[PDB]
Amino acid sequence: SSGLVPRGSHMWIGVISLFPEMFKAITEFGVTGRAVKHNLLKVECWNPRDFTFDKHKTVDDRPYGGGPGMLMMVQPLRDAIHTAKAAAGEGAKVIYLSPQGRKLDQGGVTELAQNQKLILVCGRYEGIDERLIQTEIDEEWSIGDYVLTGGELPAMTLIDAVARFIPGVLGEEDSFADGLLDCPHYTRPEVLEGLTVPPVLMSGHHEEIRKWRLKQSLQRTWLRRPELLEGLALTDEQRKLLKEAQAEHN
Amino acid sequence: SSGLVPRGSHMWIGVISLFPEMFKAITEFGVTGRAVKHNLLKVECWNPRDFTFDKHKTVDDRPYGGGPGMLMMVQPLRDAIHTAKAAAGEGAKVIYLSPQGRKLDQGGVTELAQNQKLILVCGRYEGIDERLIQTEIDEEWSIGDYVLTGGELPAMTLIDAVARFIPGVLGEEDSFADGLLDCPHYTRPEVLEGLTVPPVLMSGHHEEIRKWRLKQSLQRTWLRRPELLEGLALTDEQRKLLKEAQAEHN
Ligand SMILES: NC(=O)c1cnc2c(ccn2CC(=O)NC2CCNCC2)c1
Ligand SMILES: NC(=O)c1cnc2c(ccn2CC(=O)NC2CCNCC2)c1
């Protein structure tokens, strides 16, 4: 691979999926698409269906114990994983997305983003054999307490989230990076359905604008997500602005 | 529209996105793709870029107050929303996905799934003007405490999650529907890297298999996600099996 864009922290992500075409949604579009075109991110897919040997390329199998659903067939899925691990060489963490995994949050994104290589296994049907989790999976992660039709959308979600930490992908040490909700944002026009832009944001006063933003982030976190505040050791400035917002609310 | 598949609870989802092609990942593939082909789910996209009038089809705009990023331009985005609301007719809830929203979980999926119509607004850049949230958005939701490059992956995630509640989409009142983590699942072969299938699952004993599954779901929820247990009023059978697992662990 070749190019002028600095790629020191380039990330390689192997994906195991029965529907690799879904991943076009992050490789061909927007910020992630530009990351792939510039060689900051590489996403390489293996499809268990390509590791089958029967005439009908069977990728599901019946569960021991009955139950109404099927599981991913072990041999095609294991073979695909083994191919991806041989392509990745040494140091690739293998991740299984599922609702039984560790719950993803921005700190866990930045933990995962420290890996130069990841392999993401996407389950379909009722999931994968437990012994493959034991033998082939390093870590299990969830995007949230909800059930989807498969692990592709979780895997794409985790790719997108980690990609933002690759230097050069963005045009990061964000606002949510403070552990607070973002402040309100305003653009043209100055008046919209009779709602005006806060005068401070037109003031050109860079410090009063920084303070107002931080005070709105503290107020919104307190009102919407108060448990996120308990996670934080507020700065002296943060304590003061939060107290000011709570007095204005009351 | 026409077809033989029962579609009484068919869902219509309007999407506002600068990258509608991403939505091919759910409309053309798997369970969601079959839902769309069978007229159980309809996903219809509007792109703000199509509502621009300048020669360069501008969709971003500068934030009042400075800051390094841009915001979605109001006029194209507002026009797109208005078009989607006129297509949807009466009763469409408009949703904005963001990290400042209510945190999605399976109960909130089933709440959202009660709407026959939804419009999902996908933000890009530093987000949308606050006054559009006030004037055009009914509810703000998050998929999780992490930051992505835009609201498309959240919107697809929410589509997929709600789609599962549409009758006929699946081939539901699940296991996670108990509020518990799933039990281990096993398929062929009977022995894998010297790990055997639990004999109970080969026993053909339907009640002992149901009990073992439920006991593993309780043990795994207790060990991995103990706060999920505090949410539940366990059945007498559940209390007994949980106590049994906790004694075996100790
Ligand atoms: N929340 C996630 O990260 C998530 C959600 N669903 C996912 C994944 C990965 C795959 N699926 C499908 C799945 O696990 N379905 C089963 C749930 C328990 N009962 C059988 C169906 C991640
Ligand atoms: N968690 C979600 O549901 C989620 C995450 N990110 C999303 C969305 C929808 C859009 N984006 C991008 C975004 O909001 N980025 C900004 C975060 C605060 N600072 C400026 C960047 C949902």
Swiss-Prot record, chains A, B:
Q: Which Gene3D superfamilies match?
A: 3.40.1280.10, tRNA(m1g37)methyltransferase, domain 2
Q: Which SUPFAM superfamilies match?
A: alpha/beta knot
Q: Where is this protein found?
A: Cytoplasm
Q: What EC identifiers does the entry list?
A: 2.1.1.228
In alphabetical order, the GO MF annotations are: tRNA (guanine(37)-N1)-methyltransferase activity
Origin: domain of life: Bacteria
Which GO terms of type biological process are on file? tRNA N1-guanine methylation
GO cellular component terms, semicolon-separated: cytosol
Pfam families noted in UniProt = tRNA_m1G_MT
Amino acids binding S-adenosyl-L-methionine: G123, I143, G144, D145, Y146, V147, L148
Q: Which UniProt keywords apply?
A: Cytoplasm, Methyltransferase, S-adenosyl-L-methionine, Transferase, tRNA processing
Q: Which residues form a coiled coil?
A: none
Is this entry keyworded tRNA processing? yes
In which broad location class does this protein mainly occur, judging by the first location in its UniProt entry? Answer: cytoplasm
* Keyword match Transferase: yes
Describe the reaction catalysed, as an equation: guanosine(37) in tRNA + S-adenosyl-L-methionine = N(1)-methylguanosine(37) in tRNA + S-adenosyl-L-homocysteine + H(+)
Q: Summarize subunit and interaction data from the UniProt record for this chain.
A: Homodimer.
The protein's job, in short, is: Specifically methylates guanosine-37 in various tRNAs.
Q: Family membership, please give it.
A: Belongs to the RNA methyltransferase TrmD family.
This protein is called tRNA (guanine-N(1)-)-methyltransferase
Q: Taxonomic classification, please?
A: Bacteria, Pseudomonadati, Pseudomonadota, Gammaproteobacteria, Pasteurellales
